[PDB]
Amino acid sequence: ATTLKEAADGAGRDFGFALDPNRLSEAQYKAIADSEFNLVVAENAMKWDATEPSQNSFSFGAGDRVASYAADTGKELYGHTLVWHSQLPDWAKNLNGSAFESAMVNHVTKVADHFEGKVASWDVVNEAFADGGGRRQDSAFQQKLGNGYIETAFRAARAADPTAKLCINDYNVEGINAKSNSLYDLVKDFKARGVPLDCVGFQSHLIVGQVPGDFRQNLQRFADLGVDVRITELDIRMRTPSDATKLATQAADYKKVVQACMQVTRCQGVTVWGITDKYSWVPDVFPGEGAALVWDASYAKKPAYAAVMEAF
């Protein structure tokens, strides 16, 4: 296979990337985007603030731009994301109880309905759990609606789009711990009670050299629940600058993550959170860290590239 797309295709898996529509006008970006991936997700175009900036006033331009790109290039489209505490416009954080619940179901209904038949899978609820187990406390959704909002969101979504795979996504749930254990409990319950839920995504925003040794095991127990699992926002950061050893260990980490997926028959594939290091979100959140992606700031393939390819 000359490309990761070919490597992923032959393995019958998705290998996607987080698209920023505004960069399709940069020749090298588009070239890599068209050649190496078979799945695409909007980095920001499909979030609450980008879609409903004012109550009941939807803006689908950027979202449609990403969906058009997927359709024109023949890539699978992954939807990100319906319900998420971050990037919630102020009007929403300003509604209470009932009023707030209607805004939520309505937002879930419109966005899902608008992309029906285009979006194959949706991150219906993103980051619901707290690190260390339990529910996220700083979530407006949790605070105003309590524990039942997750269920409301998924039922509203299945009803607006009867065939999209509905997933719950989170980070720091890659290995067995109190957070993934709480997630495990939720899936098991939903499944048993018949709540529509089809897949579980593991963000995998990892640190170089610190890839969970029980990643495969964790993935596997979730699949056993009769649900599909996917690696959703993969990037393995390091303290900048990088160097031979760091790149070499990062390459090794990328290989481990992809192999973990390849070993669980129900792992749909992996989506990396971007294409090039120059546009990576990492430096803006984790000051001092970076060099997390498969391509450097000069669109040069890093050792991780051949790693991913060997893993598939």
63: Cβ contacts below 8 Å, ≥ 6 apart: 42, 45, 46, 50, 51, 111, 114, 115
Q: Which method, experimentally, gave rise to this model?
A: X-ray
Return the HEC string of 12-23.
Answer: CCEEEEEECHHH
Q: Residue 93: how many CB atoms within 10 A of its CB?
A: 13
| Beta-ladder partners of 289 | 239
DSSP 161: -
| Cα 219 from Cα 90, distance rounded (Å) | 36
Positive or negative: CA dihedral 223, 139, 64, 118: positive
- As a whole number of Å, the CA-based R_g of the chain is 19
CA angle 99, 101, 102 (to 5 degrees): 70
- Residue 127 designated active-site: yes
* H runs (alpha helix) in the chain: 4-11, 27-36, 48-51, 61-73, 90-93, 97-114, 140-145, 149-160, 178-193, 215-223, 244-262, 282-285, 303-311
Q: Residue 200: how many CB atoms within 10 A of its CB?
A: 25
Determine which one of 43, 76, 101, 233 is catalytic.
233
Q: Which two tokens stand for residue 277?
A: 């290091």
- Position of tokens 């969906």? 67
Strand 14-19 with 121-126, pairing: unpaired
Tell me if 150 sits within 8 A of 179, measured CB to CB: no
Header resolution in angstroms: 1.8
| Cα 284 from Cα 287, distance rounded (Å) | 6
- The crossing angle, in degrees rounded to 10, of helices 178-193 and 215-223 is 10
CA angle 15, 27, 51 (to 5 degrees): 65
DSSP 229: E
CA angle 54, 59, 64 (to 5 degrees): 160
119: Cβ contacts below 8 Å, ≥ 6 apart: 67, 77, 78, 79, 112, 161, 164
Which long-range CB contacts under 8 A does 218-225 form with residues at least 24 apart?
218/173, 218/174, 218/175, 218/176, 218/180, 219/260, 219/261, 219/263, 219/264, 219/267, 220/263, 220/264, 221/184, 222/184, 222/187, 223/264, 223/265, 223/266, 223/267, 225/184, 225/187, 225/188, 225/191
Residue 286 φ/ψ, nearest 5 degrees? -105, 80
| Cα 26 from Cα 19, distance rounded (Å) | 13
**Residue 23 burial class via C-beta count within 10 angstroms: exposed 0-12, middle 13-18, buried 19 and up:** middle
DSSP 54: B
Domains and their CATH numbers in the chain:
1-312 (3.20.20.80)
Q: Residue 2: how many CB atoms within 10 A of its CB?
A: 9
DSSP 62: H
| Beta-ladder partners of 239 | 289
Determine which one of 43, 76, 101, 127 is catalytic.
127
